[PDB]
């Protein structure tokens with residue numbers, strides 16, 4: 013089981029001995045520092061999961077202190093572990109962290125370079141605890157980056173949907189999470205899935221559903237939805253020469269709901285032209301508007317394959333023209349490109365579809381790796397730094413300012429986020445927020461002395477994270 | 483609020499029991515790092531998955547009811563295999579009627595070879611094999627971290643041997659800094675443990691517990707670290723008191739090696755004026771097993787390394803080694819942790835060599851590059867069904883997409899063999915049964931809810947060793 017005393021970077025175990033003597037306060041903040049996709053604004057999401065799962069309640073025990081002591085004595089080949097400091101938290105506070113965390117509400121969309129959350133110790137003895145928990149808190153970069161990058165792809169889809177159709181109907185289902193297998197772990201799967209679900213309602217990553225339910229909650233039955241679908245194994249197990257039968261059995265089994273059938277197993281073109289287009293057409297043209305056949309390619313160049321499929325289908329099914337003058341497949345027939353989809357290639361497919369006058373109403377996208385795995389902490393320059401210290405009754409504004417990288421320069425003093433008269437955000441430095449020139453601080457206390465003092469519903473988060481779209 | 487395997491799959495897999503050919507009794511599948519840099523792969527991390535997520539009673543009455551309620555709402559239709567999961571509950575007491583045979587953990591295998599196979603042991607559970615594909619495919623991550631980390635050990639070994647004549651302390655030349663740069667607490671432990679198959683330097687503590695609990699070592703810990711400063715422990719002293727911070731830290735860690743981040747304001751000024759003059763006397767006096775390790779952390783990774791080495795060279799006695807390469811005094815080293823990945827580490831060792839600096843003078847730290855900036859596509863980690871039994875007839879199945887031939891999967895029952903030349907080969911269409919040459923290298927690791935074969939972390943370390 014989890015032990016906070018073993019959930020930090022090794023070197024942090026040694027830091028209590030490095031601060032100026034008589035330091036009573038170490039105050040730190042997190043931001044997405046200002047740097048082909050720009051990501052000028054970020055979705056703040058995921059901290060509440062960290063607060064509940066790892067920082068709330070009795071997190072220090074005598075067994076946990078002892079387990080850490082023996083581990084670090086071997087790991088450092090020396091005694092540097094602060095047994096005294098951890099025992100103090102256990103005796104004085106029943107193992108509850110004397111820490112205060114202030115954060116902007118979850119789901120809020122804030123421009124780059126603004127304070128998102130602050131961390132400070134409430135007990136002078138625990139000056140070292142602020143940066144101990146940097147490691148566990150900085151991991152919030154991941155739900156932040158997934159939610160931000162997913163929202164950016166919703167902007168792309170929203171542009172082209174409206175451009176080629178004049179409406180945003182079913183925008184919530186145009187980007188589907190297929191990333192469960194392509195992530196580093198079961199926990200990353202739940203965190204990442206949940207962050208995509210702030211923007212969309214389509215997910216195959218089940219892990220995300222339980223995480224939202226336990227850490228946020230919803231008034232809705234489920235946070236995300238899926239449809240019956242096929243894989244190479246459920247097609248190929250019939251034998252090459254029985255591909256038609258596989259398709260016939262699958263589409264008949266799921267006739268009252270939409271069904272995705274992967275048709276690239278041997279020859280995507282033959283499957284669309286002959287099998288769906290000739291041989292099984294009678295089962296396809298009969299389907300409900302609420303229950304279409306979603307044809308799925310999974311190989312080759314994403315744009316070219318998508319195009320080639322749409323024309324092959326256009327030449328075997330009645331392709332109507334809309335109010336914007338864009339080619340639209342019949343409702344009982346849809347498409348899903350779930351291969352090689354990331355923010356870049358998604359932009360390319362929808363632009364290439366617009367150029368060949370194909371409506372975005374015809375396709376939905378599936379993304380795995382590019383959605384939940386192909387992201388780093390550099391993408392948004394998610395960083396945690398110390399901005400203020402109190403040593404021997406004196407408070408000072410501290411920061412890093414490396415000569416070779418001015419982008420690595422951090423903020424000074426006590427910070428606050430404010431709403432400007434023009435309706436924007438400004439981060440105030442050096443305690444200037446106390447004057448409330450631009451009203452009250454937008455950061456709220458979300459954690460204080462082992463207690464989660466403010467929680468957000470996933471419904472509030474979704475609303476806060478909405479697209480401007482005007 | 484605990485782990486439920488019925489909710490641990492891709493949603494569409496919940497529907498596949500209704501899609502396989504009628505009267506299918508067996509579904510046999512395998513894993514490989516498909517062929518296209520990264521010629522061979524370290525097979526690592528399955529033992530973690532089997533023990534944590536697959537062994538024992540993974541099915542309970544409450545778990546079936548949890549999954550049923552969710553999937554009803556998730557699909558807005560009843561497509562859940564209540565009967566099929568209750569069958570595993572009543573018959574096997576929630577144990578998985580699955581058999582998994584894998585190549586030994588740590589084994590270095592070339593691309594496009596069978597690494598592990600999965601099949602159902604009961605005909606009612608034909609659907610079970612690929613339900614657990616999602617959880618098993620996640621083994622891509624420990625495999626890829628272990629493979630990419632071993633690849634950087636190859637680069638480091640080449641240049642350390644070239645500039646010093648030995649491979650001394652190679653296991654300490656690439657240190658894990660990735661704990662904050664990963665996506666979760668669970669990823670940190672899997673990833674940190676995967677780097678520790680090749681190295682012994684880590685700041686990702688989460689990796690030690692995983693090793694102790696799922697693999698084990700003769701030694702008390704598989705990974706080691708030293709005291710080190712951070713910008714907060716420097717900057718807290720004030721901009722004018724960088725020398726006081728430095729002095730205090732090097733004094734606190736006087737008898738052990740200590741890393742001090744020196745770029746807070748001006749890396750070059752901390753090297754020439756502070757370390758090179760004002761505190762020089764506290765550096766020249768240090769023990770060979772307790773040096774000062776200067777840490778640059780901004781600027782161009784190679785230029786900074788060289789400019790720093792150039793400065794320390796003009797303030798500290800630089801000597802020529804057995805290979806004719808510049809070596810700093812034993813009480814002084816450099817750690818380059820910023821912007822280190824496989825490509826940049828190459829550029830830095832490449833660059834240092836041309837400038838006649840021994841790789842003895844430097845250790846590298848890698849965060850995101852080592853544990854995060856990796857994907858399933860790096861080694862093309864894939865799980866596919868190669869064999870089925872329908873109406874008592876065993877048919878060899880595969881996929882061969884016209885658009886991509888590199889996506890073609892293997893057919894029939896597989897087995898892995900070492901040829902007499904010493905290379906490897908995967909036998910398809912049940913050809914293993916001929917016993918042409920050598921025994922199958924895939925050994926049963928899982929059977930009917932039980933982990934049948936295990937490896938210690940020391941065994942895995944042995945297997946994953948470089949040739950030289």
Ligand SMILES: CCC(=O)N[C@@H](C)c1ccc(NC(=O)[C@H]2C[C@@H]2c2cccnc2)cc1
Pocket residue numbers: 185186188189190191213214216237238239240241242243270272306308348350376378492493494
């Ligand atoms: C919910 C409203 C709706 O009707 N949504 C539509 C748009 C929709 C269309 C297709 C799918 N599923 C697939 O394609 C799955 C086979 C592919 C897959 C999953 C996981 C991993 N790898 C591949 C899901 C939903």
Ligand SMILES: CCC(=O)N[C@@H](C)c1ccc(NC(=O)[C@H]2C[C@@H]2c2cccnc2)cc1
Pocket residue numbers: 021022023654655657658659660682683685706707708709710711739741775777817819845847
């Ligand atoms: C074990 C034998 C030995 O002595 N190894 C040497 C090579 C060694 C040298 C330096 C360090 N640690 C550092 O520099 C840490 C400050 C940097 C850091 C850590 C975590 C996250 N971000 C940055 C660790 C080990």
